[PDB]
Amino acid sequence: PEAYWNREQEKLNRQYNPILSMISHLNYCEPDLRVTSVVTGFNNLPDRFKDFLLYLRCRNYSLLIDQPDKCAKKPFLLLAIKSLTPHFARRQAIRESWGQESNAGNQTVVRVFLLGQTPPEDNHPDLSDMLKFESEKHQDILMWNYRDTFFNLSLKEVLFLRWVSTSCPDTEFVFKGDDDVFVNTHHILNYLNSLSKTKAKDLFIGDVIHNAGPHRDKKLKYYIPEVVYSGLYPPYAGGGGFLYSGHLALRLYHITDQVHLYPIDDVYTGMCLQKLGLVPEKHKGFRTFDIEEKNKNNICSYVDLMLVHSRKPQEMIDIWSQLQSAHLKC
Ligand SMILES: *[C@@H]1O[C@H](CO)[C@@H](O[C@@H]2O[C@H](CO)[C@@H](O[C@@H]3O[C@H](CO)[C@@H](O)[C@H](O)[C@@H]3O)[C@H](O)[C@H]2NC(C)=O)[C@H](O)[C@H]1NC(C)=O
Ligand SMILES: O=c1ccn([C@@H]2O[C@H](COP(=O)(O)OP(=O)(O)O)[C@@H](O)[C@H]2O)c(=O)[nH]1
Ligand SMILES: *[C@@H]1O[C@H](CO)[C@@H](O)[C@H](O)[C@H]1NC(C)=O
Ligand SMILES: [Cl-]
Ligand SMILES: [Cl-]
Ligand SMILES: [Mg+2]
Protein backbone atom coordinates (compact mmCIF):
# COMPACT_ATOMS: atom_id res chain seq x y z
CA PRO A 1 0.00 0.00 0.00
CA GLU A 2 1.03 3.60 -0.69
CA ALA A 3 -1.17 4.99 2.09
CA TYR A 4 0.66 4.97 5.41
CA TRP A 5 -2.11 3.74 7.72
CA ASN A 6 -3.27 0.94 5.41
CA ARG A 7 0.31 -0.32 5.13
CA GLU A 8 1.12 -0.26 8.85
CA GLN A 9 -2.21 -1.94 9.62
CA GLU A 10 -1.44 -4.77 7.19
CA LYS A 11 1.90 -5.16 8.98
CA LEU A 12 -0.08 -5.57 12.21
CA ASN A 13 -2.36 -8.02 10.38
CA ARG A 14 0.61 -10.25 9.56
CA GLN A 15 1.97 -9.89 13.10
CA TYR A 16 -1.23 -11.11 14.77
CA ASN A 17 -2.11 -13.72 12.09
CA PRO A 18 0.40 -16.53 11.42
CA ILE A 19 -1.63 -17.77 8.43
CA LEU A 20 -1.05 -14.46 6.64
CA SER A 21 2.66 -15.37 6.79
CA MET A 22 1.91 -18.34 4.49
CA ILE A 23 9.98 -1.59 17.87
CA SER A 24 6.79 -1.77 19.94
CA HIS A 25 3.75 -0.42 18.11
CA LEU A 26 2.07 -0.03 21.52
CA ASN A 27 4.49 1.56 24.01
CA TYR A 28 7.31 3.12 21.94
CA CYS A 29 6.70 6.75 22.89
CA GLU A 30 9.70 8.36 21.25
CA PRO A 31 8.94 10.24 18.02
CA ASP A 32 8.89 7.80 15.10
CA LEU A 33 11.57 9.44 12.96
CA ARG A 34 10.99 7.10 10.03
CA VAL A 35 7.68 8.73 9.03
CA THR A 36 9.38 11.89 7.72
CA SER A 37 11.13 9.89 4.98
CA VAL A 38 8.35 7.42 4.13
CA VAL A 39 5.18 9.55 3.79
CA THR A 40 5.24 11.82 0.75
CA GLY A 41 4.98 15.46 1.78
CA PHE A 42 5.26 15.03 5.55
CA ASN A 43 6.66 18.47 6.37
CA ASN A 44 3.90 20.10 4.28
CA LEU A 45 1.08 18.34 6.18
CA PRO A 46 -0.94 20.08 8.90
CA ASP A 47 0.52 19.91 12.39
CA ARG A 48 -2.14 17.46 13.61
CA PHE A 49 -1.19 14.77 11.09
CA LYS A 50 2.50 15.24 11.90
CA ASP A 51 1.84 14.75 15.63
CA PHE A 52 -0.48 11.82 14.91
CA LEU A 53 2.06 10.02 12.71
CA LEU A 54 5.11 10.74 14.89
CA TYR A 55 3.57 9.30 18.08
CA LEU A 56 1.23 6.69 16.57
CA ARG A 57 2.79 3.85 18.60
CA CYS A 58 2.36 5.37 22.08
CA ARG A 59 -0.77 4.43 24.02
CA ASN A 60 0.45 3.44 27.52
CA TYR A 61 -0.86 6.59 29.18
CA SER A 62 -1.78 6.63 32.86
CA LEU A 63 -4.69 7.96 34.89
CA LEU A 64 -4.11 11.20 36.77
CA ILE A 65 -7.65 11.36 38.19
CA ASP A 66 -9.56 8.15 38.87
CA GLN A 67 -12.88 6.94 40.29
CA PRO A 68 -12.00 3.28 40.89
CA ASP A 69 -15.24 2.42 42.72
CA LYS A 70 -17.59 4.17 40.30
CA CYS A 71 -18.78 0.62 39.57
CA ALA A 72 -18.26 -0.79 43.07
CA LYS A 73 -21.94 -1.69 42.75
CA LYS A 74 -22.83 -3.36 39.45
CA PRO A 75 -24.33 -0.78 37.04
CA PHE A 76 -27.01 -1.47 34.47
CA LEU A 77 -25.94 1.49 32.29
CA LEU A 78 -22.62 3.35 32.20
CA LEU A 79 -22.74 6.89 30.81
CA ALA A 80 -19.31 7.75 29.37
CA ILE A 81 -19.25 11.35 28.11
CA LYS A 82 -16.25 12.70 26.24
CA SER A 83 -15.45 16.20 27.47
CA LEU A 84 -12.79 18.91 27.43
CA THR A 85 -11.29 20.60 30.49
CA PRO A 86 -12.96 24.05 30.07
CA HIS A 87 -16.41 22.54 29.38
CA PHE A 88 -17.64 23.07 32.93
CA ALA A 89 -21.07 24.33 31.85
CA ARG A 90 -21.67 21.28 29.64
CA ARG A 91 -20.64 18.74 32.28
CA GLN A 92 -22.74 20.43 34.97
CA ALA A 93 -25.85 20.58 32.78
CA ILE A 94 -25.42 16.87 32.03
CA ARG A 95 -25.18 16.15 35.77
CA GLU A 96 -28.46 17.95 36.53
CA SER A 97 -30.37 16.67 33.49
CA TRP A 98 -30.01 13.45 31.51
CA GLY A 99 -26.72 12.23 32.99
CA GLN A 100 -27.86 12.11 36.60
CA GLU A 101 -27.09 8.86 38.40
CA SER A 102 -30.10 6.88 39.62
CA ASN A 103 -31.39 3.45 40.63
CA ALA A 104 -35.01 3.03 39.51
CA GLY A 105 -35.91 -0.60 40.14
CA ASN A 106 -32.26 -1.14 41.12
CA GLN A 107 -31.15 -0.48 37.56
CA THR A 108 -28.04 1.55 38.32
CA VAL A 109 -26.94 4.39 36.05
CA VAL A 110 -23.43 5.70 36.72
CA ARG A 111 -21.67 8.58 34.99
CA VAL A 112 -18.07 9.36 34.06
CA PHE A 113 -16.57 12.14 31.96
CA LEU A 114 -13.64 11.30 29.68
CA LEU A 115 -10.96 14.00 29.68
CA GLY A 116 -7.40 14.40 28.55
CA GLN A 117 -4.87 17.09 29.39
CA THR A 118 -5.01 20.62 28.02
CA PRO A 119 -1.37 21.45 28.78
CA PRO A 120 0.10 24.97 28.83
CA GLU A 121 2.37 23.88 25.96
CA ASP A 122 -0.59 24.44 23.60
CA ASN A 123 -1.30 27.85 25.19
CA HIS A 124 -4.17 26.38 27.24
CA PRO A 125 -5.25 28.43 30.27
CA ASP A 126 -4.35 26.75 33.57
CA LEU A 127 -7.69 25.36 34.78
CA SER A 128 -6.25 22.34 36.61
CA ASP A 129 -7.10 23.67 40.08
CA MET A 130 -10.78 24.05 39.20
CA LEU A 131 -10.74 20.61 37.56
CA LYS A 132 -9.45 19.17 40.84
CA PHE A 133 -12.12 21.05 42.79
CA GLU A 134 -14.79 19.66 40.46
CA SER A 135 -13.32 16.14 40.48
CA GLU A 136 -13.51 15.89 44.27
CA LYS A 137 -16.95 17.53 44.47
CA HIS A 138 -18.64 15.30 41.86
CA GLN A 139 -16.35 12.24 41.55
CA ASP A 140 -17.19 11.67 37.88
CA ILE A 141 -13.94 12.85 36.24
CA LEU A 142 -11.59 10.43 34.49
CA MET A 143 -8.46 12.08 33.10
CA TRP A 144 -5.36 10.54 31.51
CA ASN A 145 -1.97 12.19 30.89
CA TYR A 146 -2.15 12.78 27.13
CA ARG A 147 -2.95 15.78 24.94
CA ASP A 148 -6.74 15.97 24.59
CA THR A 149 -6.96 16.79 20.88
CA PHE A 150 -9.29 15.95 18.01
CA PHE A 151 -6.80 13.50 16.46
CA ASN A 152 -6.18 11.83 19.85
CA LEU A 153 -9.82 10.83 20.40
CA SER A 154 -9.27 7.22 19.32
CA LEU A 155 -6.67 7.19 22.09
CA LYS A 156 -9.46 8.39 24.39
CA GLU A 157 -11.55 5.45 23.18
CA VAL A 158 -8.82 2.89 23.87
CA LEU A 159 -7.97 4.34 27.28
CA PHE A 160 -11.65 4.36 28.27
CA LEU A 161 -12.06 0.73 27.19
CA ARG A 162 -9.06 -0.19 29.35
CA TRP A 163 -10.75 1.52 32.29
CA VAL A 164 -13.89 -0.55 31.69
CA SER A 165 -11.73 -3.68 31.56
CA THR A 166 -10.16 -2.76 34.92
CA SER A 167 -12.71 -0.83 36.99
CA CYS A 168 -16.09 -1.55 35.39
CA PRO A 169 -16.14 -4.89 33.49
CA ASP A 170 -19.45 -5.82 35.14
CA THR A 171 -21.63 -3.06 33.66
CA GLU A 172 -24.53 -4.32 31.57
CA PHE A 173 -24.47 -1.57 28.93
CA VAL A 174 -22.29 1.36 27.90
CA PHE A 175 -23.39 4.62 26.29
CA LYS A 176 -20.47 6.64 24.91
CA GLY A 177 -21.46 10.15 23.84
CA ASP A 178 -20.46 13.78 23.49
CA ASP A 179 -21.00 16.63 25.95
CA ASP A 180 -22.96 18.74 23.42
CA VAL A 181 -25.65 16.10 22.83
CA PHE A 182 -29.02 15.57 24.48
CA VAL A 183 -29.80 11.99 25.49
CA ASN A 184 -33.25 10.76 26.48
CA THR A 185 -31.96 8.44 29.19
CA HIS A 186 -35.49 7.36 30.10
CA HIS A 187 -36.06 6.13 26.54
CA ILE A 188 -32.69 4.34 26.49
CA LEU A 189 -33.51 2.45 29.70
CA ASN A 190 -36.86 1.40 28.23
CA TYR A 191 -35.11 0.20 25.06
CA LEU A 192 -32.50 -1.79 26.99
CA ASN A 193 -35.20 -3.52 29.05
CA SER A 194 -37.09 -4.43 25.85
CA LEU A 195 -34.17 -6.30 24.27
CA SER A 196 -34.03 -10.07 24.05
CA LYS A 197 -31.30 -11.75 26.07
CA THR A 198 -29.70 -12.88 22.80
CA LYS A 199 -29.66 -9.42 21.20
CA ALA A 200 -28.48 -7.83 24.46
CA LYS A 201 -25.23 -9.84 24.44
CA ASP A 202 -23.71 -8.22 21.32
CA LEU A 203 -25.64 -4.95 21.25
CA PHE A 204 -24.11 -2.04 19.34
CA ILE A 205 -26.50 0.59 17.94
CA GLY A 206 -26.19 4.13 16.67
CA ASP A 207 -26.31 6.33 13.58
CA VAL A 208 -24.45 3.75 11.50
CA ILE A 209 -22.82 4.81 8.23
CA HIS A 210 -21.99 2.31 5.48
CA ASN A 211 -19.78 2.80 2.40
CA ALA A 212 -18.23 6.02 3.70
CA GLY A 213 -14.80 7.25 2.74
CA PRO A 214 -12.26 9.87 3.80
CA HIS A 215 -13.04 13.48 2.95
CA ARG A 216 -10.42 14.77 0.51
CA ASP A 217 -11.49 18.44 0.71
CA LYS A 218 -8.52 19.79 2.67
CA LYS A 219 -10.69 22.55 4.16
CA LEU A 220 -13.01 20.04 5.86
CA LYS A 221 -12.77 19.06 9.52
CA TYR A 222 -12.47 15.30 8.89
CA TYR A 223 -10.09 15.75 5.96
CA ILE A 224 -7.75 12.78 5.51
CA PRO A 225 -4.94 12.92 2.91
CA GLU A 226 -4.63 10.06 0.44
CA VAL A 227 -1.06 9.49 1.65
CA VAL A 228 -2.49 8.71 5.11
CA TYR A 229 -5.48 6.47 4.36
CA SER A 230 -6.84 4.92 1.17
CA GLY A 231 -10.05 3.03 0.48
CA LEU A 232 -13.41 3.03 2.21
CA TYR A 233 -14.31 3.12 5.88
CA PRO A 234 -15.85 0.10 7.63
CA PRO A 235 -19.43 0.49 8.88
CA TYR A 236 -19.39 2.72 11.94
CA ALA A 237 -21.76 4.71 14.13
CA GLY A 238 -21.03 8.36 14.81
CA GLY A 239 -22.47 11.84 15.15
CA GLY A 240 -22.85 12.12 18.92
CA GLY A 241 -22.99 8.72 20.58
CA PHE A 242 -23.66 4.98 20.44
CA LEU A 243 -24.97 2.28 22.78
CA TYR A 244 -23.55 -1.20 23.37
CA SER A 245 -23.24 -4.00 25.91
CA GLY A 246 -20.57 -4.44 28.56
CA HIS A 247 -19.68 -7.85 27.13
CA LEU A 248 -18.90 -6.20 23.80
CA ALA A 249 -16.85 -3.51 25.56
CA LEU A 250 -14.50 -6.20 26.88
CA ARG A 251 -14.21 -7.79 23.43
CA LEU A 252 -13.66 -4.37 21.85
CA TYR A 253 -10.80 -3.51 24.20
CA HIS A 254 -8.95 -6.78 23.64
CA ILE A 255 -8.57 -6.31 19.86
CA THR A 256 -7.57 -2.63 20.06
CA ASP A 257 -3.94 -3.79 20.23
CA GLN A 258 -4.46 -5.28 16.75
CA VAL A 259 -5.79 -2.05 15.20
CA HIS A 260 -3.65 1.03 14.65
CA LEU A 261 -5.00 4.28 16.05
CA TYR A 262 -6.90 6.52 13.63
CA PRO A 263 -7.45 10.30 13.67
CA ILE A 264 -11.25 9.76 13.71
CA ASP A 265 -12.35 7.94 16.86
CA ASP A 266 -15.72 6.78 15.51
CA VAL A 267 -14.02 5.25 12.47
CA TYR A 268 -11.55 3.51 14.79
CA THR A 269 -14.35 1.89 16.81
CA GLY A 270 -15.85 0.73 13.52
CA MET A 271 -12.52 -0.78 12.48
CA CYS A 272 -12.51 -2.53 15.86
CA LEU A 273 -16.01 -3.98 15.46
CA GLN A 274 -15.22 -5.18 11.93
CA LYS A 275 -12.23 -7.16 13.21
CA LEU A 276 -14.55 -8.83 15.74
CA GLY A 277 -16.79 -10.00 12.89
CA LEU A 278 -19.65 -7.68 13.89
CA VAL A 279 -21.53 -4.87 12.16
CA PRO A 280 -22.89 -1.83 14.04
CA GLU A 281 -26.69 -1.66 13.89
CA LYS A 282 -28.49 1.44 12.63
CA HIS A 283 -31.10 2.91 14.98
CA LYS A 284 -33.11 5.91 13.77
CA GLY A 285 -33.60 7.24 17.31
CA PHE A 286 -30.09 8.74 17.08
CA ARG A 287 -31.00 12.13 15.59
CA THR A 288 -27.50 13.26 14.64
CA PHE A 289 -28.89 15.74 12.08
CA ASP A 290 -31.17 17.27 14.77
CA ILE A 291 -34.97 17.20 14.55
CA GLU A 292 -37.18 19.33 12.32
CA GLU A 293 -37.31 22.95 13.45
CA LYS A 294 -41.12 23.02 13.40
CA ASN A 295 -40.93 20.40 16.20
CA LYS A 296 -37.85 21.60 18.12
CA ASN A 297 -40.16 23.04 20.81
CA ASN A 298 -42.63 20.12 20.91
CA ILE A 299 -41.59 17.96 23.86
CA CYS A 300 -43.34 14.97 22.26
CA SER A 301 -40.55 14.88 19.65
CA TYR A 302 -38.08 13.95 22.42
CA VAL A 303 -40.13 11.18 24.07
CA ASP A 304 -39.30 8.23 21.78
CA LEU A 305 -35.95 9.77 20.81
CA MET A 306 -32.60 8.25 21.76
CA LEU A 307 -30.25 11.15 21.07
CA VAL A 308 -30.23 14.56 19.38
CA HIS A 309 -27.26 16.66 18.27
CA SER A 310 -26.66 19.27 19.27
CA ARG A 311 -27.75 21.18 22.41
CA LYS A 312 -26.40 23.93 24.63
CA PRO A 313 -26.30 23.42 28.43
CA GLN A 314 -29.45 25.49 29.01
CA GLU A 315 -31.42 23.50 26.43
CA MET A 316 -30.43 20.16 27.98
CA ILE A 317 -31.89 21.33 31.30
CA ASP A 318 -34.96 22.88 29.65
CA ILE A 319 -35.77 19.77 27.60
CA TRP A 320 -35.13 17.37 30.49
CA SER A 321 -37.39 19.52 32.68
CA GLN A 322 -40.29 19.41 30.21
CA LEU A 323 -39.65 15.69 29.66
CA GLN A 324 -40.62 14.78 33.23
CA SER A 325 -44.32 15.50 32.57
CA ALA A 326 -44.41 14.64 28.86
CA HIS A 327 -46.30 11.39 29.50
CA LEU A 328 -49.28 13.47 30.69
CA LYS A 329 -49.49 15.19 27.28
CA CYS A 330 -47.67 12.98 24.75
C1 LIG B 1 -1.62 12.81 21.61
O1 LIG B 1 -1.14 12.92 22.95
C2 LIG B 1 0.27 12.68 23.07
C3 LIG B 1 0.59 12.71 24.54
O2 LIG B 1 0.19 13.93 25.14
C4 LIG B 1 1.04 13.74 22.27
O3 LIG B 1 2.42 13.41 22.33
C5 LIG B 1 3.24 14.55 22.64
O4 LIG B 1 3.47 15.33 21.48
C6 LIG B 1 4.28 16.49 21.71
C7 LIG B 1 4.27 17.28 20.43
O5 LIG B 1 2.94 17.53 19.97
C8 LIG B 1 5.67 16.06 22.17
O6 LIG B 1 6.45 17.21 22.49
C9 LIG B 1 7.50 17.45 21.52
O7 LIG B 1 8.74 16.84 21.88
C10 LIG B 1 9.76 16.99 20.87
C11 LIG B 1 10.99 16.23 21.31
O8 LIG B 1 10.70 14.84 21.29
C12 LIG B 1 10.05 18.50 20.65
O9 LIG B 1 10.93 18.65 19.54
C13 LIG B 1 8.75 19.29 20.38
O10 LIG B 1 9.04 20.68 20.34
C14 LIG B 1 7.69 18.98 21.43
O11 LIG B 1 8.16 19.50 22.66
C15 LIG B 1 5.56 15.18 23.40
O12 LIG B 1 6.84 14.64 23.72
C16 LIG B 1 4.58 14.03 23.19
N1 LIG B 1 4.37 13.31 24.43
C17 LIG B 1 4.36 11.97 24.52
C18 LIG B 1 4.13 11.41 25.89
O13 LIG B 1 4.53 11.26 23.54
C19 LIG B 1 0.57 13.74 20.82
O14 LIG B 1 1.17 14.83 20.13
C20 LIG B 1 -0.95 13.86 20.73
N2 LIG B 1 -1.39 13.74 19.35
C21 LIG B 1 -2.07 14.69 18.71
C22 LIG B 1 -2.44 14.39 17.29
O15 LIG B 1 -2.39 15.75 19.25
O1 LIG C 1 -10.16 17.33 21.51
C1 LIG C 1 -11.32 17.03 21.76
C2 LIG C 1 -12.35 17.47 20.94
C3 LIG C 1 -13.65 17.05 21.19
N1 LIG C 1 -13.92 16.36 22.33
C4 LIG C 1 -15.30 15.98 22.65
O2 LIG C 1 -16.00 15.55 21.50
C5 LIG C 1 -17.38 15.81 21.72
C6 LIG C 1 -18.00 16.53 20.53
O3 LIG C 1 -17.00 17.12 19.72
P1 LIG C 1 -17.45 18.01 18.46
O4 LIG C 1 -18.80 18.57 18.74
O5 LIG C 1 -16.47 19.08 18.19
O6 LIG C 1 -17.51 16.96 17.24
P2 LIG C 1 -18.46 17.18 15.95
O7 LIG C 1 -19.88 17.19 16.36
O8 LIG C 1 -18.13 18.48 15.32
O9 LIG C 1 -18.23 16.09 14.98
C7 LIG C 1 -17.49 16.63 22.99
O10 LIG C 1 -17.80 15.76 24.06
C8 LIG C 1 -16.09 17.16 23.17
O11 LIG C 1 -15.81 17.44 24.52
C9 LIG C 1 -12.91 15.91 23.15
O12 LIG C 1 -13.18 15.21 24.13
N2 LIG C 1 -11.60 16.24 22.86
C1 LIG D 1 5.40 3.29 27.64
O1 LIG D 1 6.30 2.27 28.13
C2 LIG D 1 7.67 2.45 27.74
C3 LIG D 1 8.43 1.27 28.29
O2 LIG D 1 8.57 0.24 27.32
C4 LIG D 1 8.19 3.79 28.26
O3 LIG D 1 9.52 3.99 27.78
C5 LIG D 1 7.29 4.93 27.80
O4 LIG D 1 7.72 6.15 28.38
C6 LIG D 1 5.84 4.65 28.18
N1 LIG D 1 4.98 5.72 27.69
C7 LIG D 1 4.19 6.44 28.49
C8 LIG D 1 3.37 7.50 27.82
O5 LIG D 1 4.14 6.25 29.70
CL1 LIG E 1 -34.91 -7.75 20.27
CL1 LIG F 1 -39.76 15.49 14.29
MG1 LIG G 1 -20.69 17.56 18.89
Numbering used by the authors: 55 to 76, 90 to 397
Relevant lines from the article:
β1,3-N-acetylglucosaminyltransferases (B3GNTs) are Golgi-resident glycosyltransferases involved in the biosynthesis of poly-N-acetyl-lactosamine chains. They catalyze the addition of the N-acetylglucosamine to the N-acetyl-lactosamine repeat as a key step of the chain elongation process. Among the characterized B3GNTs, B3GNT2 is the major poly-N-acetyl-lactosamine synthase, and deletion of its coding gene dramatically reduced the cell surface poly-N-acetyl-lactosamine and led to hypersensitive and hyperresponsive immunocytes. The luminal domain of B3GNT2 comprises an N-terminal helical domain (Pro55–Cys125) and a C-terminal catalytic domain (Cys138–Cys397) as well as an extended linker (Arg126–Lys137) that connects the helical domain to the catalytic domain.
The luminal domain structure of B3GNT2 was solved by single-wavelength anomalous dispersion phasing using an iodide derivative to a resolution of 2.50 Å. Subsequently, B3GNT2 structures in apo form or in complex with either substrates or products were determined by molecular replacement using the iodide derivative structure as the template. The six structures presented here were solved in different space groups and the number of molecules in the asymmetric unit also varied. The recombinant proteins used for crystallization contain residues Ser31–Cys397 or Lys45–Cys397, but only residues Pro55–Cys397 are well defined in the electron density maps, except for a disordered loop between residues Leu77 and Ser88.
